[model samples]
Target chain A: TTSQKHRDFVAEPMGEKPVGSLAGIGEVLGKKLEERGFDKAYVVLGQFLVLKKDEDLFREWLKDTCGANAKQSRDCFGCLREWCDAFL
Target chain B: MTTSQKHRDFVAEPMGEKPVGSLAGIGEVLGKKLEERGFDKAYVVLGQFLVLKKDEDLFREWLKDTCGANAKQSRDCFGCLREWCDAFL
Candidate 1:
């Protein structure tokens, strides 16, 4: 099942959800993303969009940026994909 | 006029993953170029716009560099995004 966080994230415009709200972005990854100035979900969304939502590219970027493993990056990429489909 | 019909149409609603060509001033040739370079969706270009913090000169330069958009084309595209951001972003 899609995680509740994913569902909540794609339900509407992100508005100003913090970095931690995105799927797979737990405390550690969130802190890393925030530390690099990606404190807001929209900023990451900006990055996702800039990569054209390419699965491999986004996943690799997430992994590189915050040391996300396969599942973590996949979940985060899927979360952003769904949100983009619904709202972008 | 301050805007084109295409500009009005684009700014009128959410982008919703529309093709890059749907953007104002991004016609067939430039749109094709943008698509070839990974900006297949209007939202993708919007991503770049937001990433650059929506600065006029920066965005215009990026657009020109990316697809060789001329001044008028850049103005229309930038204005479309600006108004859209004001209304929707």
Candidate 2:
């Protein structure tokens, strides 16, 4: 039933997964995020929780932090949102 | 039996919004320290644990530096978080 990167990412507890595993996080953006102290998926999830699951806020932050475009930012945010929905 | 009773209690369910003190080694003093450092909730500390990728030595060092957690306390707390992640992450 569930398909796409977003569905796959939210499928588990995020144990030891990389920041690059999220829907829109390619190697370039992954490097950018790691340098910014979000080297792991849980760290990024921490930021999501710290942001209180605010999509707009997370989107803006992704853009500023790693120069994520609108679609990239949305994909990543949506990935985390689904993960939180299932786990948080 | 093998782990702290606090560890057992902590990992029994969803973390929800439990305070930092709910962790095995975090008591009044260390909990206050963690709170002041913005790790007031158990989940926030869990966030930190995951962020470090569960590196044992680094996590122990962080416990000492952040709250002066003694070796025993550090081990207990780290153990608690470790098992919790294993079950739920």
Candidate 3:
């Protein structure tokens, strides 16, 4: 299984979910994003939409923004992609 | 009823990852800079619109900082999203 986090995240509206709820975004990265005004999952979703959901761009952004490694960045990217596919 | 066709066009439908160029005031120059800065989609700009709590001045400032948007450009883009949120949110 890739991530139950992904399934749970994409199942419904993000609805005030903290940044930590996104796949691969742990306490550390979540805190980083929050400090940068991405406190809510929707905010990150905003960034994703801004990037037009481009995989490379999103991953690189995650990496640059919070020092996310390959798997961490990709996992979150995939989660957001799944979410938008169903809901966006 | 709407005044500008651009406003009407944007608010008429839910923004589903449309390009930034499709937004009011986001012409080729602004759109290109926006894309370069990771604002490729109309909905993405909408996200910032939502994040800023729909504050006209705050968003206007951000647009200027992010892409050198003039006052009119910021107002046009802001108004477009404001109208969309009114109907949906």
| True-structure lDDT of candidate 2 | 0.83
Task: Compose the digit string of candidate 1's lDDT tens values, residues A1-88.
Answer: 7899999988877766798999999999999998887888877888888987779999999998998999889889999888877766
Off by over 4 Å in 3: B1-9, B24-40, B47-55, B64-73, B82-89
Maximum-lDDT candidate: 1
| Complex DockQ per candidate | 0.52, 0.44, 0.30
Interface RMSD of each: 1.6, 2.3, 2.8
In candidate 3, what are the lDDT values of residues B1-89, reduced to their tens digit?
Answer: 54578778888876776789888889999999999997778888887876675689999999999999999899999988887766643
Report lDDT (Cα) of residue B83, candidate 2: 84
Model 3 lDDT per residue over A1-88, tens place = 6888888988877766888999999999999988887888877877776666789988998899888999999899999888877755
Q: Enumerate the chain B TM-scores of all models.
A: 0.95, 0.95, 0.92
RMSD of candidate 2 to the truth, in angstroms, is 3.1
Which parts of model 1 have CA positions greater than 4 angstroms off?
Answer: B86-89
Model 2: per-residue lDDT, tens digit, A1-88?
Answer: 3337677788888887889989888899999999988888888887776565679988998999998999888889888888866775
Clashing pairs in 1: none
TM-scores, one per candidate = 0.82, 0.79, 0.69
Task: Summarize candidate 1's per-residue lDDT along B1-89 as a digit string, tens digits.
Answer: 66778888888888886898888889999999998998899988889887676789999999999999999899888888888877765
Q: What is the lDDT of residue B73 in candidate 3?
A: 90
